[PDB]
């Protein structure tokens, strides 16, 4: 009935096309499923961006000593300076850190027509010699697959001129129909061209968390806590991340998925090509993050190590239980909506639950179906017309280099226990019966939910926040941390609640109406 | 901070870094949101539209809404003709503006739509309901700057909705170029307290920085009104003020209705702000009022009592064309030196207007630079630093890396609440910029100095 | 810096150090300079006079006239009749103001001088040309402060000058209080876009903020007229914005010609310009109109929106009362901690008033001083920190020595260029508050933060 | 004349106080005769301040480490915090300084009433326990001498309980007729309680600097170039002095007098007690400071001082010769007037000189005749009833300590050579003929000059200073220096002269008239 009140405005062809995206959870349709990964209906006011911000955007532009160049107008340039607050700092002090710069070829009208070859060569050179770095990204807009400029053509010539590697991505902003294919775009490049191709010798409990990109200083919350357990952090793809570390993500014993989707196919060809087993994981809200070192214990199976991590877990949540009773106390019974990318919406539940928090609706703006219902449903997964000529990669089991790290006969029992290997069970199975998903949400449906459920705060982003506040409801962002973070960790519940708790309690909520009325 | 960038300059012809330009399609949707109840629509990929909205959000802390053709390889291949005529319908049905203002992007100027093809076969197919108005301009990413983006919709506005029916409404238009809300505010003001009818478009006041009601309101109440629009044909004259973004649109609105149109400065500073008097006392004959006179008055008395911490101060600035020609003249009013002065906006007409004023001062030594950015002024100051640095956030980034004292102006600021309730045009503006100047210096001064040369008068 | 203060506490009995106050005659000169053709005059020795004229010429960066009596060693034993008789004379030939306000100090009160008859003599002996006037109001400057003194010429010159001839004029008498001349014209604007007919005394804008024109005015045009003055005693209703500064002027007014009074805070803020406006309308049945509901919802728009950097933080406040009382009340409406809060102008009213607002808010452990100095708030500093410090110029030297991000608010502030141009009353004020506020936090957190921690957006 | 036109105004009886005050330089008369140092007109806008300023605010209060208490409602303290810019700092980077606070009893009515000594005790008290200061000083103001309280006792009284000298002046603000009479009443005091009570053995070519107050540095600036030179300087009184220093001040040879005004009366006294010659001196532009520096010279008569003395006035002539050959280039031809308070009208005259300027007009706030026209002249003043009251001390020649510097036929050899001992020539013999002096100069006078003479600048003070530049006239302040110096010093020439020039140039005198005007 809501998702029939949601639906009631929506023209006739338009309602058919919406009503497969609006799900309400039931118990007698406790697995119900949802159309997702779809092209966005041209005119409803979507949230979504392009195949270019996916991969430029969110998965290379972090890796810090690695010059990454647009090739496209200004814009594409410009949009990506420091709006997505990725963390990096000088490796170990003293490392490159291109992170407080956009880096462009500016095409002009002349580029349109005659072609842009010659000045992205020149650019690639001029960035070269200027900045000697470990590698040079190249990414491809919109216009640059429909004027014939051939970017890989041109990245081999010149990375064969300068003595590094050039890595083109053809990520133009048309291609599938969301960020989603820029983050499977990255995925393809990085994996055949970067990992593996490291020198170095693995380490002792060596671990990488895949789909990670330090938004806020979550990364580095993570690996403190990490490394107190006793782990080596191989690698952060990409949070934080030089080159020569994602070349030697191989070097490791345990894969770990924060972010499903942007990542997960690095996740499986890993798992294939080295032999190295991937869990999920979520380093947010005490019981995600608990409950994830209590997996990832098991997997390696070591009474000294598993004991060291819930000696830490004791020290950690001891430093903070005080801060948790508070947010509980100011929050309890409160209710809330969700709006984020690709994994958020999930991965925030358990901590908002902790807090007494109700989430009465979800959605998220380029997830599919596996994220909503979990990767058993991938089989029946059909790939459609606009995400058709997103390359698939298939890669095969390195000789020199496979392992079992995980006995066959193992990893079954851990599976048996309840350890997410290789699976992921999406964000629906945690959320409340009665509850509803909204895939691709735009402005209108927004508004309905508003109306009719009155929620207490709506987590999304920029282009939301405002509209929410201006209807007197409170909208932290989940994308940015409204300029916070961590959020992430044990330290993340705490500046993450204390956040929330100053959001709701903010005075001018009850000034709004004037004296005068 | 900023550690990558050398001090010794190798000269870049291709790799353009740390931009002070972004691109069209941003100006265009500004333009647009300066129209009342109108839905600004970008033709083309979705994540154009996202990106522009954003920054919008992000410097006024207020919604900026608009729509997409959502583009996918689909369109790269037949056009984007039924994005739109689907977009129109949807947008119509479930957001019901009273106009929808349509722009472009490298995608679709790239692939050659034809805007105005779907355009009529829309209306011949009945996809725009009565009473209802759709327009569009082209906005090509690759061409000029957001600043061209704006001006590029301004005439789209003219083209579509200024109509001389003969009829003499006794207004002067005003297109008030690429400037805030505030500045717009305060040119009305102006006009109000000269006693001088008007029509100013766009007009994004009481759109970008309106209050909090408890109840969000799409379509907010300020705006320029079609009606209005229409009747910007039946004018006696139209003020151009910032030839960049404004001309265009003027131009086009005596061209189509023969409304006569004279050209002035963004109105920065004492010699801008006296043109922008001078030309509405002559255009209707009226007298320059009291208060304004007074404005003026308190204006020239704190550059006077403010003289010492001003004169031969060193200038960095970069930004859009029209505002950064007369704050550098407003600069050199002051008796400060434009030392650094950058747009990444093509065009010839800021590096005659620059080298001019620099000329006509005696002030040599100068780099003035048309397309260039954030990079070239961090090296240029590597090299000889300057004690006050004026471009909008991204110059915090040097402001720090350099320890000058640094003032954010034009677009985008996006790293401070509520400096969009204030205007830098007029004798008002000029008297916040001043404060604004002087306070990030003597903070400096006072912060660094020794305990023995701390001072309580300033 | 400021090596001396100890972070352990003693209590001082006797011993005053870095006073957040001044003597009441500069309030006194300040008031009589807010009457148009006006002298003030001091009767006493002229250092007085001197210093008087001083500080305001060091806040306002503008001239400050005032004559003196000049007392010598032989008047100060015997009294100071002849010296203040020479006076008139030469002011009134010398320099013709249409009237001179008389104040006092410590040395002609502690004499017991008796002015009314030292100016009836003058006035029985022709000392005072047709058409011209002598005021005066005593001026201990042992008693209060200068806000007190502020309040005394006020009642001086409802004394000499407020008639009641029955001739109702259908207007709203304000004082102001001891506020700024920006503030002053604030309060007034708001009265004009209210449409309400209003007599305002004192005021001194156009009197203390006005512009260089290139000849020197010893009367600026501001100043409310004499006449003005006399028919204050025809109102229908006075307002009294302010306890400390103004309610003895409403009072004295009420006695002497029966016109009614309602005290109001300082507008300073989202309930106390509430309160003021709601006035406004419930004494003239008249509309809150349109543009003061804009402005109110783009302040609550901004505190919505600038939320996350006030709530919690810990405030320091020191200044005059009524100024102090109303700002505290909008730092507990943004969410944020009046932490220490100090007058030094002596007075229940502020204790009782600041209490009640903390208990109200829950807030528990603030430090409230009634005649407490600025050595008070820098030890209690030093025992438990605070994010914000906010008062007149001489807190600087905390700012500085602590690291605390610093509001220049109030009386006197003579360290920067314009800042007399920008109210702090009325919704518009409130605004640039926190604009004000939020700056100055958000410049502590870039300048300190890790470079990795470092933003764009904020 | 413009005498004539100044006095039109006036009422008769005024105007013939008044003709006094205001005298025309001629040939007929090359020295006329001035009247200074008299009742100021009640009602006429003067400039001046009182006794208590000119004791507690002027000579006392530059000792850093030293607690200056006003005894007095609060006003008389609050005042004088921080706008006088003497320049302190901590002896030795670690002594005691005081600056940056004031210190009041901060008397009520009960104090008016039952009398404030009780008050003034136990802030002594609580001073000194909270402080321990080198020493105390106490100030009385307008009321203190009406209702009675015995100040000097108090004093005493608590000097004996705490250990540390208490210092009490009995400034009120009615003594005298101007700031000159604290001067005096600070000088009886200092001579007689403080200095020859130090226990320091004097060092060679050891000078004092008397009168010089460390305004914006410019102490600290003749200092270096003195010390350079090789003098010791034992004591600056009271410029960044220590109590010490002040106590240890007969430990010289010389005296040297910058301000003749304030500190004459220890220069006579210390002469007279000590047998210590002094100097004129003026360490203000570079003739100014060179003729002070060879004046020293000659008085030490040693070679080497000699050598020293040309070798650095050449090096730092040298370093600022083109910034001296700028001021002259811009200035040349410009007009001035001065009116500053008792000394500087006089000692910035050599420096506008020598930067082309003509200085039309001169006047001193609350100087004496012999400031105006040499100290010959005063056998001749004539105290009058407003000053008689100010007491005179007599002191005698030191029976064990008092010594000849300089043999009796050397002094007067130098004089011979024109070395200023124990003398001083007065404002008017350095001045133009046909100029003119306005003593005790009100605002009246000062519009007149202005209309007549329409000067390019006017060097006054803070109260002046908008009144003139309102009427597009330059105004730069000889007091505060704008919070800019030193102003004295070879260094001081240079922050001078860029200051004027740039008040001279900018732009905005040109943009006052509106276009449409
Ligand atoms: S990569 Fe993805 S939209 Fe997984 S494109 Fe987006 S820094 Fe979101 S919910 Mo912005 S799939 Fe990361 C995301 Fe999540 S940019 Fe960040 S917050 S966890
Ligand atoms: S003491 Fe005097 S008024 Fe000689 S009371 Fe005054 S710090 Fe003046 S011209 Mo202010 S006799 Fe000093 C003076 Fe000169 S306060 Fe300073 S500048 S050289
Ligand atoms: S969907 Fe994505 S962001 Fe859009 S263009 Fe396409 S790759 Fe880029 Fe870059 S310059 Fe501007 S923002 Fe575009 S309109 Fe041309
Ligand atoms: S001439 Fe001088 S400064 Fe004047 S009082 Fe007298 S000693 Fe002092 Fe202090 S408190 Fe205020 S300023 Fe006076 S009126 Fe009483
Ligand atoms: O303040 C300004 O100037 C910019 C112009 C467009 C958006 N705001
Ligand atoms: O509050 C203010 O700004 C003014 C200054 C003088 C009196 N009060
Ligand atoms: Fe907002
Ligand atoms: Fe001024
Ligand atoms: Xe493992
Ligand atoms: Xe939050
Ligand atoms: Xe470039
Ligand atoms: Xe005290
Ligand atoms: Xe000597
Ligand atoms: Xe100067």
Redesign the interface.
Known sequence: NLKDEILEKYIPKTKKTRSGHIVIKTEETPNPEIVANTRTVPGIITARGCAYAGCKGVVMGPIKDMVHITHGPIGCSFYTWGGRRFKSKPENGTGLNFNEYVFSTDMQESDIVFGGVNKLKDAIHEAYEMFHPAAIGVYATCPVGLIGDDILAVAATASKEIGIPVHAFSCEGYKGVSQSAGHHIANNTVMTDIIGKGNKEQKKYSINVLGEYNIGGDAWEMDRVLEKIGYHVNATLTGDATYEKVQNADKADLNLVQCHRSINYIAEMMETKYGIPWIKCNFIGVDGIVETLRDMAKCFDDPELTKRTEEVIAEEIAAIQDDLDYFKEKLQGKTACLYVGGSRSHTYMNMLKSFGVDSLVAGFEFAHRDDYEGREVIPTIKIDADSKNIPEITVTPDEQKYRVVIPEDKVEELKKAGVPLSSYGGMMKEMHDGTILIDDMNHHDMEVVLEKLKPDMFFAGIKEKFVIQKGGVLSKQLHSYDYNGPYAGFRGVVNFGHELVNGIYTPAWKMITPPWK | ????T?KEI?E????????A???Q??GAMYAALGIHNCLP?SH?????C??????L??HF????????????????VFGGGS??K??????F???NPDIIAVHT???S???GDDLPTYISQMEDAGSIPEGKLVIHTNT????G?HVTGFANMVQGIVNYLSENTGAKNGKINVIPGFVGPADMREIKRLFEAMDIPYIMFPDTS?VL?????????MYPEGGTKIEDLKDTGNSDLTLSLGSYASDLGAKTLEKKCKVPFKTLRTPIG?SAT?EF??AL?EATGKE?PASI??E???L?????????????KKVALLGDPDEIIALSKFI????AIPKYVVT?TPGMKFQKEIDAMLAEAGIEGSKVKVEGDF?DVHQWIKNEGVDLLISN??G??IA?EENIPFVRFGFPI??????Y??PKVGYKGA??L??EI??VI?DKI??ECT????????
Chains 1, 4 share one sequence.
């Open positions: 901070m900023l550690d990558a050398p190798v870049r012809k291709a790799l353009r870094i740390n931009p330009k972004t691109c399609p941003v629509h083309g990929s979705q994540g154009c996202s990106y522009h909205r954003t920054v959000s992000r802390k207020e919604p900026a809404m608009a729509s997409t053709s959502s583009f996918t390889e689909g369109a790269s994005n739109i689907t977009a129109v319908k949807n947008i049905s479930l957001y992007t490298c995608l100027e790239t692939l090509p990413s690759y061409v700057s009481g920085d309106g209050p909090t009601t408890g109840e969000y309101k004492v006296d008097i001078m006392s320059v006179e007074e003026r008055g308190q020239i008395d704190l550059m006077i009592d403010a003289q010492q911490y001003l004169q031969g050199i009013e002051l008796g990444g990079f956030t991204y915090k980034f720090r996006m790293d401070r609440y509520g400096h309730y204030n008297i916040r001043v404060e002087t306070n003597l006072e912060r305990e023995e040369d701390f001072e309580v008068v300033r």
